[PDB]
Point group: D4
Chain length 113, copies 8
């Protein structure tokens, strides 16, 4: 278990060293913070758009080097989209999910893509 930032914002400990990836991640932190402030459709739309987009871009980056962990990673992503598409308002889950995802799954592709 990694610490959950408060305020729930990206910090340099999340750096992957892929600047486009890092810049997209900042948008996912932000989407989750807005929902924590107000659980509404606008905020969910914002997060869901940024998530969908980030997951696809990152997947494309993985495929460009035929990354061996692509299948498993894509599955993790798809499971989170499902959660956003069946949103129940569990912001705590989302806060945790994103921190652990970056620091354990994204961190495993560093130097391989």
């Amino acid at each position: 278990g990694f610490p959950i930032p408060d305020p729930y914002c990206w910090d340099i400990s999340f750096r992957t060293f892929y600047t486009i990836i890092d810049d997209e991640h900042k948008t996912l932190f932000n989407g989750i913070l807005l929902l924590s402030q107000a659980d509404n459709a606008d905020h969910l739309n914002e997060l869901r758009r940024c998530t969908g987009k980030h997951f696809l871009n990152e997947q494309q980056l993985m495929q460009s080097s035929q990354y061996a962990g692509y299948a498993e990673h894509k599955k993790a992503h798809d499971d989170f989209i499902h959660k956003l598409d069946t949103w129940d308002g569990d912001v705590t889950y989302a806060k945790n999910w994103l921190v652990n995802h970056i620091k354990t799954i994204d961190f495993k592709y560093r130097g391989k893509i």
Copy 2:
């Protein structure tokens, strides 16, 4: 039921806030107006090309954020192409179809893609 513009041209009430989308939509209004002036092959070709192109671009935009309503939207598009490919000269149908499509189906992706 939304009002059918006369002359059958795009107005700012159709704005989606995606400038490329709006610019493509203007070409679909125009294609339908020409057919209303003269139901010939040139006019149908023009509309059919612009429709095919717009539908594909918009679909690509939807996919870039893994838009959850993609499947349903694509199906709506494909049904209209079919109509254009089996054209019977029913310009009234087309005039209605396009107004309702933009204002109810396209308007639902705003803020999500």
Copy 3:
């Protein structure tokens, strides 16, 4: 000296056979049509954006084949941008300008770019 379409909308007599160019032209016609219905800011912004975008894209297209008539063409474009930036509500001027510009200046690059 060419006729002014009424309603003020693109027709196949304006085809340049550059589909990209034709599709952008359809947006300039629409832009002038809106102004002709309501001379306001939303409508002028719409024409202005489309005009600026079309003129630059067309200019790029000319540059790609090192078109001999570029400088003269670009000077024509810049003059019209200038009129839009100092709009005076002279919708008749604009209806006229566009019709002649396409049918005389743009028709000139066909087959050369």
Copy 4:
């Protein structure tokens, strides 16, 4: 004169309806937030990179439609780059600058680019 969000993070009141622009803005907010926590080099590099990248992309976007307010806008951007290149630790200035810049200068191009 606009309120400063606390915590210093992007919110939907800043939406420009250009998703690319909004997503880059989220990175400038985060950049200023880091500096507000720790005024060090890692944090300033992060803000500086994101700022330089966003300003140039936004500038390109303005240029694509030959935006009339470009020169004034670019001069605003260049002044802020300059402050970052001679950073003085004035985090309050930066919090302020960004908020007003978006809500006044960037809001101005909406519908024109």
Copy 5:
């Protein structure tokens, strides 16, 4: 039956009005002329590369507007590649094939893509 140019070179009667397409077609005329001069591997390689490339690009152009005749056209292309991949030295067939293909199959997509 259309006349077979002699020398076997592209002329403006083959124009499709798509400059990229026309420029690629010129390379197919050339590939067939070389083979007519000397039926060797170099010449076949040249034609086969240019054919493969042209067919794919043109197919991509067709798909961008969801051209209704794509399937039939692609099949015609694939049948010619097969011939090149099982080359028997029948230059007369190839000379005929290309003239008839452009003037009857390619000419049918004009204004639709």
Copy 6:
């Protein structure tokens, strides 16, 4: 001093091993061939377009690797554009020019760009 192919068409002795470059060259040969059959405007426009496009693309290619012989090369190109812009019907000049240009100036960048 190189032989002039008859018929005036590209052959593999002109290969530069840059497939893009070779394919554009084939269009310049064809352009000169048309003029050699009929010295008219359709034919000159065709050569002129292809020439302008090829020279700029090749120039870009040179620039991408910061080619040392660029300035000299570009000056050669610009002189020939100039002859085409003041065409005098001297088809012999053109047949000659192209053959030597490729086999001397273009052959020089091989392996350096």
Copy 7:
């Protein structure tokens, strides 16, 4: 059997005449040399990334001209990735594999793509 360079580095005998391909190949020689110096995860990651990327790019190049040997070539590539993904430390195999691959399989696409 072709000679194995020592030091295990790319030389001009490996030239394919496709500069992007040659530049990528240099990265595969380097990846294998590092492993020969120290069989660790960093070195394997480096080679595996460069291999995955090169194989995909080259495959894309093959497909752009509908290269007839694509299937067989892709299979050869996939078999090598498998080896890297089940790495047993047999650097000798890898040194041999790459030399023979370039000089017999890659060399067969020259002039065809």
Copy 8:
């Protein structure tokens, strides 16, 4: 003052964490290695091409985030191009130059571009 790798090949101590940059650097190392084996034209062309291409790409990368140290960096690059354009066979200079350039000038932009 950094050690010179022997054999003169890239190693992970040179990583900048910009995979594109690292992969281009590997080509400069190889270029200098060839010259170190045979001081001829094929080898110098190879280094020169790769150097020109890498320096411009890296320069573009710097420009994309409006890097503060660009002008100083570009001046360093241009000096080395100049040495290659007036090659004197001083391979020791080159081995040295590259090692220090990366480890001092290039290492400086990390995290800022």
